[PDB]
């Protein structure tokens, strides 16, 4: 019952026999929490589920005028971000005043600025320049020396508060580096704790191999969802990858929008039997969508009345609330970019992934890196409006090309199920368990209890 018809799109669909030759199906590579002795079963959407969108006071719902940018707007956005973060840090840390960058002095001073690189290459411990805020330093630049710093962790576009001695006003010798202050957690309400138990499935694209348009992994995932009967299903893009070999050469014989609509119809009609909730998160690799971050939601006007209550489309990125548990959804490969563009020094062994996740959490932004990667487009007004973290999410989801992992950083669970397909072989997806903890505990208990990364 493959509603999607690869033969109807292109006459050159040859399935990858390697994927069909797999034999390690159902293997749980890794787990976390109370995942031992617990069977994974849900109500199949027959219970009570609440979905909401939070974040900016105006959630992204429609498109916007895009192909028009001016430098003063970008400068204003950057200055406002730097000033707000610096003011919050100063108020939290009880600092007296910020010395201007170009003012020389013989005594230790506290400065505020943005970490940047003076060259077009990667950052290193010898080419770091601090760029201060407009109000306090008129956007001046001054090289920074980290030879006297015991520990540090920097990437371009990071807002830091540094203390040191600036004798000449043209070079600063580092002596300290304040740590980021995470946002406060969400406060549950009476209705949030009313939900007893539910579990959520998460998967990310692409849904095909590198040599076929059969979408066999999509059918396997649909069958898995039907068998398991989960509560809420969240599927990431891209649904029609623009890096596919067939799509790049324009060998498809059908319009992109029609193919995407057929795929959506296939998914919805396959998952109707389970009765769960579906959420679709757009990605920048879709070939029939605007390549600008943030991204307006998907459009599909052929929905049935019943399917409206079970099929939902959200923006990219989106902060989704499920039964009072805040989720952080983003399809961008933040971890890969940050790892490629990060430098640090440690006196002992440390986890790079934990450091990157902590930097993401403490920057109060979904894309703290600046300048962005060479293959990304950002609309800075829309980015400043619709891409801000409201609060620290209880559960954070971020697919990436790196190795799958489940980690707890600063009380926020980070899950990276990874791609569903890796070249011509199957990948992995994840399943989450959500139980509201008792309110009699001394400290806030993590609602997420069990997470399993299941091979597909």
């Amino acid at each position: 019952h493959q509603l999607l018809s690869p033969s109807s799109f292109s006459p050159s669909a040859t399935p990858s026999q390697k994927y069909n030759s797999r034999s390690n199906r159902g293997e749980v590579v890794t787990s976390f929490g109370l995942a031992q002795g617990v069977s994974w079963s849900g109500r199949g959407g027959a219970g009570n589920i609440s979905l909401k969108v939070l974040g900016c006071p105006e959630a992204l719902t429609g498109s916007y005028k895009s192909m028009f940018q001016k430098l003063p707007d970008i400068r204003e956005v950057l200055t406002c971000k730097i000033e707000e973060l610096g003011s919050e840090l100063k108020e939290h840390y009880k600092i007296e005043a910020f010395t201007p960058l170009l003012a020389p002095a013989q005594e230790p001073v506290t400065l505020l600025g943005q970490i940047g690189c003076d060259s077009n290459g990667k950052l290193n411990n010898k080419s770091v320049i601090l760029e201060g805020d407009r109000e306090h330093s008129s956007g001046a630049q001054i090289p920074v020396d980290l030879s006297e710093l015991k520990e540090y962790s920097l990437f371009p576009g990071q807002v830091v508060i540094m203390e040191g001695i600036n004798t000449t006003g043209r070079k600063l010798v580092a002596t300290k580096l304040y740590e980021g202050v995470p946002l406060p957690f969400y406060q549950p309400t009476e209705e949030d704790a009313d939900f007893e138990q539910s579990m959520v499935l998460v998967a990310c694209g692409p849904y095909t191999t590198s040599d076929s348009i059969t979408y066999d992994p999509l059918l396997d995932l649909i069958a898995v969802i039907n068998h398991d009967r989960p509560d809420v299903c969240i599927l990431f893009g891209p649904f029609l990858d623009a890096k596919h070999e067939q799509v790049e050469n324009c060998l498809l014989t059908s319009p992109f929008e029609d193919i995407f609509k057929q795929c959506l119809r296939t998914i919805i009609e396959g998952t109707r039997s389970s009765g769960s909730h579906l959420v679709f998160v757009p990605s920048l690799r879709d070939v029939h969508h605007e390549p600008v971050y943030p991204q307006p939601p998907f459009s599909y006007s052929d929905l049935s009345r019943e399917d409206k209550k079970q099929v939902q489309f959200v923006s990219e990125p989106c902060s989704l609330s499920i039964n009072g548990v805040i989720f952080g959804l983003t399809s961008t490969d933040l971890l890969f970019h940050l790892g490629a563009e990060e430098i640090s020094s440690s006196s002992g062994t440390s986890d790079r992934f934990s450091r990157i996740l902590k930097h993401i959490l403490t920057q109060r932004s979904y894309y703290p890196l600046y300048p962005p990667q060479e293959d990304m487009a950002i609309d800075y007004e829309s980015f400043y409006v619709y891409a801000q973290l409201p609060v620290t999410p209880d559960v954070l989801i971020i697919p990436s090309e790196l190795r799958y992992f489940v980690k707890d950083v600063l009380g926020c669970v980070c899950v990276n199920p990874g791609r569903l397909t890796k070249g011509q072989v199957g990948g992995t997806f994840a399943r989450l368990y959500l139980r509201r903890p008792a309110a009699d505990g001394a400290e806030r208990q993590s609602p997420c209890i069990a997470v399993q990364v299941v091979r597909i």
Partner: protein, 197 residues
């Protein structure tokens, strides 16, 4: 006062390989040739040996057009800045925060001002060009003699050809209906008057 040829002088011409013979077909106008050779650019392939009608490849042409438009949009949004100083020519993506009376100050020489490498005007002109070469109605209306227009409509421009041209034109008009370069905000224009809001 500028003509169509002068207005779109710097626009990159659309090129699509013929699926049958593989040879590319450079498109620059609705009609190719002058004089007695009034023929749609999609009617015949460049290769005389090739007999495949390019009009049969409407879906492939639309897909290639979408890919090209996406590539141009991504190219514009990269934001490359080049120093105006002839002796500096600094090329960077990092926008300096130390502005001046005119624009950003180049950190390499500290005497000149950076300029965008690919301005929004060029991108809008490119999109308008990609709409222009697939508008058969305007091309027919531009014909001086009505008898020649009627003859061309009868011999070649069947309603299906007009529908295909409309589809191709809509493929670019969809992107063109989101640009902020063709939408004036009167609220900011008349923000200086507050006697009556």
């Amino acid at each position: 006062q500028l003509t169509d040829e002068e207005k779109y002088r710097d626009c990159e011409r659309f090129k699509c390989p013929c699926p049958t013979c593989g040879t590319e077909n450079i498109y620059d106008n609705v009609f190719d040739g002058s004089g007695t050779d009034m023929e749609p650019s999609l009617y015949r392939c460049s290769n005389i040996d090739c007999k495949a009608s390019p009009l049969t490849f409407t879906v492939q042409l639309s897909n290639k057009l979408i890919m090209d438009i996406r590539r141009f949009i991504k190219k514009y949004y990269d934001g490359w800045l080049i120093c105006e100083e002839p002796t500096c020519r600094n090329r960077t993506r990092h926008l300096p925060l130390q502005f001046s009376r005119t624009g950003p100050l180049c950190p390499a020489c500290m005497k000149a001002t950076l300029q965008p490498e690919y301005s929004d005007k060029s991108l809008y002109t490119q999109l308008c060009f990609y709409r222009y070469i697939f508008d058969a109605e305007c091309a027919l209306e531009k014909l001086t003699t009505d008898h020649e227009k009627d003859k061309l409509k009868k011999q070649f421009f069947t309603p299906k050809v007009l529908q295909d041209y409309r589809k191709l034109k809509n493929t670019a008009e969809q992107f063109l209906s989101r640009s902020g370069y063709s939408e004036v905000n009167l609220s900011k224009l008349f923000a200086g008057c507050a006697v009556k809001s």
